[PDB]
Design a protein around this nucleic acid. Structure first.
Ligand SMILES: [K+]
Ligand SMILES: [K+]
Ligand SMILES: [K+]
Ligand SMILES: [K+]
Ligand SMILES: [Mg+2]
Ligand SMILES: [Mg+2]
Ligand SMILES: [Mg+2]
Ligand SMILES: [Mg+2]
Ligand SMILES: [Mg+2]
Ligand SMILES: [Mg+2]
Ligand SMILES: [Mg+2]
Ligand SMILES: [Mg+2]
Ligand SMILES: [Mg+2]
Ligand SMILES: [Mg+2]
Ligand SMILES: [Mg+2]
Ligand SMILES: [Mg+2]
Ligand SMILES: [Mg+2]
Ligand SMILES: [Mg+2]
Ligand SMILES: [Mg+2]
Ligand SMILES: [Mg+2]
Ligand SMILES: [Mg+2]
Ligand SMILES: [Mg+2]
Ligand SMILES: [Mg+2]
Ligand SMILES: [Mg+2]
Ligand SMILES: [Mg+2]
Ligand SMILES: [Mg+2]
Ligand SMILES: [Mg+2]
Ligand SMILES: [Mg+2]
Ligand SMILES: [Mg+2]
Ligand SMILES: [Mg+2]
Ligand SMILES: [Mg+2]
Ligand SMILES: [Mg+2]
Ligand SMILES: [Mg+2]
Lengths: 86, 134
RNA sequence: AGCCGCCGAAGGUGGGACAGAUAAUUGGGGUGAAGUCGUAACAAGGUAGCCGUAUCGGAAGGUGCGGCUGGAUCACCUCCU
RNA sequence: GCGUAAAGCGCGCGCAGGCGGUCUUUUAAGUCUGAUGUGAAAGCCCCCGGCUUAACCGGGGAGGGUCAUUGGAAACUGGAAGACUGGAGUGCAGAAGAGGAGAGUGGAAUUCCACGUGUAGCGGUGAAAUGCGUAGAUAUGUGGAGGAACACCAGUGGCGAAGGCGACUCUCUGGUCUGUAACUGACGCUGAGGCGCGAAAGCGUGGGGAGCAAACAGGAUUAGAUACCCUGGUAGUCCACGCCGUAAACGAUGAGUGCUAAGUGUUAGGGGGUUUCCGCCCCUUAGUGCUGCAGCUAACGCAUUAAGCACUCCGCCUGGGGAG
RNA sequence: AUUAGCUAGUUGGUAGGGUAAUGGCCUACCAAGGCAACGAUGCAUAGCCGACCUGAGAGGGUGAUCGGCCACACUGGGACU
RNA sequence: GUCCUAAGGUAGCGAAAUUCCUUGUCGGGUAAGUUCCGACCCGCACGAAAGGCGCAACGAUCUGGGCACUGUCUCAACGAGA
RNA sequence: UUAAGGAACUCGGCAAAAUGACCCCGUAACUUCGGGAGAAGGGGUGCUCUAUUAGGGUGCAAGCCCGAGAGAGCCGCAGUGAAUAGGCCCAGGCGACUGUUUAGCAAAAACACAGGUCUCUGCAAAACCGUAAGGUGACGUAUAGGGGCUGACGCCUGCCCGG
RNA sequence: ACCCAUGUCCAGGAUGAAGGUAAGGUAAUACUUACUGGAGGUCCGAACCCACGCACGUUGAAAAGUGCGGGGAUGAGGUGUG
RNA sequence: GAGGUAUG
């Protein structure tokens, strides 16, 4: 996932102008990466080493997502429809 | 183990086996179903009588009887002492005790209780082998 | 009182399930002073052993594919005291 | 208790649960505490008495509850509301790599086909023989076909959760480490039950099949040889797809965190002193190996890559065999 | 757990009747809940306790005799008094 | 061990649509079973594409047993019509 | 149509009898996971009133058709009241199957079948008919065509090349 | 009998293959449930075709039928004309 | 010192 696209998708959902280490940012970038990898797997189905890192991204995403849900539920019910989860 | 492990499953001790399984089972003809009852002694009917060659190191012939107990279990019983009264269809009383020489025997015949007539000519340990005092 | 109805034990019928006893026969298991055929393992056990798998073979077992050293003697290389 | 004795799932992704960094306030779910009530008599226990003592019997007391209500404390666990950063993660700047999938590509080199030269052996063994060969080999050169694996580099070297991954290029991808203190602010550790991956052998369908090769045939060997040994040789080995899900799947050593002497290689980094860079030196991070102090161990031996000292979590063992 | 789903008056509600008395105790109507990996459902076992035996104690086993409570009087059901 | 062979029948099945002896034997079913089912194996004379062994569904197939039903029968009677 | 019995008949339950329709409950071993299965085994069906019915169809509406449960009752030995309309189960051999066959004695376990295998054939194919021409094959082209054998599917198919 | 071309016939009902859509479910697939759909040498069953069993007929109503039952019945189908 | 390449 390229640096420029990464910068785009962090800066367009950053909670404020300094921030690039929030769960909003991480969950977004992870959704980008896991969707690109879903395509990668649907092409190269038997690259299970890649599928490993896929599932690690998914797990980290779910982890951040549960923390956010516990922290502020409005952020959560916002992000799910802003990103396409659930 | 961890305490959480010990809570998810407590301990479980060992399943004890008895020296004498067949003494620890009763029967009722009605139900035709065995009933666990701790018993010291049982009486039976000698199916067969014979001799055995025992294990290494030993070589002497050992007197046994294949008995059908009161509860229907078929059992091999050692015939201790010098000489005996027993033959086929002879009634016998049976206590527990393991003949270490002999593989398939786990029990003894009480000598002097029933048609097991006492030993001949014995003077010592008479309460064993079932001779009266002279 | 009698009669009618509801609920209603037992009983009958039916098909399933469950547990046990028994059974022609069959399978392997184990035990048993001195029976039989071989010698597979232990040493480099005389083809190094062993794990899985396939196949074959009177029997142990053999051969193949991969794997380990729980591998004996001899060699150069790395490394250490 | 689990390196070697029985005992670490082959490895991971992770729901539930268990466990959880530092500080302030609040409570009182757990904890602790004063009071009241009860926990029968008989029995255990203590103290008296009575039976010729004893056993026995009587009297009195005591004990016993994860007992309940009520009233108090906030140290710890838990719940709640905030705050912080050494954990955890993102960002930023760099570095290595046989990490994986796909497609294509190279030359050695085994075999085969053709053609010259070419004459009687070649092959193999402890000896041989079976076998190939005058219908012309063996070899030697040229050219062509076919597939399989990829010397040197290559190294107790790299990467990967493990299995495992070595010829080259491109595409698509994963993870790791180093430095910063930018950003969030405990977001974490484990992980039953599930889900997937998972050497080699093997199974189904269709190709390919050069070599090697179970089975098998022949020749020797042998007392015999359903084997080692020789000559041949089918399955297979290779590919696509899908099953199988086992292993001496092993570091026979579960994942995580911290702490507790050294010496020395080696890999990937960073920092600083010196010096014309080079080069040497020291400090530090993550790996990987050797030898060793404490300590542990039945010993062998492990020893900052613990088999040490401690905590969390999971799995597993409880004599041999039967019996996986 | 070599037993994971169970329940259908089953769960709650509005009315009604019934018992010495509350209550799906029962009836009618409405909704579709309720319980359960904190082991429900099912199978086998067992009367429960005071207490008894043992043990350094924690605990292990038992529930004869004595006392308390429960259940049952050939098996099943039902009422009358 | 030895003769002969081109080589001597492997698995699986087996008194068989194959078994003479043979109503084989044992078991089950029946009051009683030369038939039937299951096993055994001295396979007279199974046997691997004259295919071997197995098998759901199928069958106016063959075979044995059972429930129900019945004038098939014990043992016949009446009626109608041609 | 038949008392009582109910396969004792008989080569043999031949024939006959019995079952029979719609709805509802429920349904086994085995299984090629489609089936078995209408398994089996059982229950209810009539008429009247609630009823121009709850609800549907049609229609501009009037009107016209279908008719869901339920209660409350009525009558009979009996309510698909007649006729028409499966007997079921267990076990086994054979052939997988549907199909074909001896017009006029044999319907089958025989033939065929899909599938497997061998074999041949380079195209003016092979094979076949015919003296030949000419044709089929085939207006095809070795994933095609002819012949032989086996006969779905599953697990397999062994040794012998002397004749 | 086999075939060629051309026509025509098969009442009514039942089951419910592939596929597709939607909800649930997932990181995404699986996968589940429903609905739709309309497949089959499929089922039941008349016409049509056949001919399994029995009885009768047997100088027949008939030189192969009649009656009662029976199998197939959208297919390897039946039949007509030439 | 370690790692690597016939019977009893
Ligand atoms: K294969
Ligand atoms: K390994
Ligand atoms: K109730
Ligand atoms: K036989
Ligand atoms: Mg040996
Ligand atoms: Mg050896
Ligand atoms: Mg061999
Ligand atoms: Mg061990
Ligand atoms: Mg007391
Ligand atoms: Mg393989
Ligand atoms: Mg009891
Ligand atoms: Mg103790
Ligand atoms: Mg017959
Ligand atoms: Mg053959
Ligand atoms: Mg037919
Ligand atoms: Mg009659
Ligand atoms: Mg009658
Ligand atoms: Mg008869
Ligand atoms: Mg007769
Ligand atoms: Mg009949
Ligand atoms: Mg047929
Ligand atoms: Mg005929
Ligand atoms: Mg006929
Ligand atoms: Mg064919
Ligand atoms: Mg011609
Ligand atoms: Mg045939
Ligand atoms: Mg049809
Ligand atoms: Mg039919
Ligand atoms: Mg007819
Ligand atoms: Mg039909
Ligand atoms: Mg006609
Ligand atoms: Mg004509
Ligand atoms: Mg020796």
């Amino acid at each position: 996932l390229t640096q420029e696209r990464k910068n785009e998708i962090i800066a367009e959902y950053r909670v404020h102008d300094t921030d690039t280490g929030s769960p909003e940012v991480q969950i977004a970038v992870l959704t980008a990466e896991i969707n690109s990898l879903n395509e990668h797997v649907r092409v190269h189905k038997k690259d299970h080493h890649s599928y490993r890192g896929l599932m690690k991204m998914v797990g980290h995403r779910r982890n951040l997502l549960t923390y956010l849900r516990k922290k502020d539920v409005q952020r959560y019910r916002e992000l799910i429809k802003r990103l396409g989860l659930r | 183990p961890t305490i959480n492990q010990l809570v998810r499953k407590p301990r479980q001790s060992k399943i004890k086996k008895s020296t004498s399984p067949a003494l620890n089972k009763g029967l009722n003809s009605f139900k035709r179903e065995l009933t666990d009852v701790n018993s010291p002694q049982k009486r039976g009917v000698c199916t067969r009588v014979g001799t055995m060659t025992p294990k290494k190191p030993n070589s002497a012939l050992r007197k046994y009887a294949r008995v059908r107990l009161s509860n229907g279990i078929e059992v091999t019983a050692y015939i201790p002492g010098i000489g005996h009264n027993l033959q086929e269809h002879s009634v016998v009383l049976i206590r527990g005790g393991r003949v270490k020489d002999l593989p398939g025997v786990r029990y003894h015949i009480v000598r002097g209780a029933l048609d097991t007539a006492g030993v001949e000519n014995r003077g010592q340990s008479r309460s064993k082998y079932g001779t009266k005092k002279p």
